[PDB]
Amino acid sequence: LQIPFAMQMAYRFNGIGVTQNVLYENQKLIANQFNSAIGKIQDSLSSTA
């Protein structure tokens, strides 16, 4: 069933017991923290065997 990705992430926030307005009010920060955390994994897997 399709759903917009920020609305899926808002359901994940309800699932951990965080009220979903906390996602929509911080969405730009949450996306930047996710994108940066995937970047650190490229660096770890590039640098270290």
Binding site: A6, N21, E25
Partner: protein
């Protein structure tokens, strides 16, 4: 506890796992802040079930 949906012209709340549309009210929704922050918010009326009793 739900999701907002539209049939194309009108807006409803519904439960997430089974389509059952309901009028959007102060009781099936909660407020947080103003409309300037949320990416993709839509203008619609939210009904207040006390107001008909004050109109009486």
């Amino acid at each position: 506890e739900g999701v907002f949906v539209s049939n194309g012209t009108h807006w409803f709340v519904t439960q997430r796992n089974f389509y059952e549309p309901q009028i959007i009210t102060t009781d099936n929704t909660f407020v947080s802040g103003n409309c300037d922050v949320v990416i993709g918010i839509v203008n619609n009326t939210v009904y207040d079930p006390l107001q008909p009793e004050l109109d009486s």
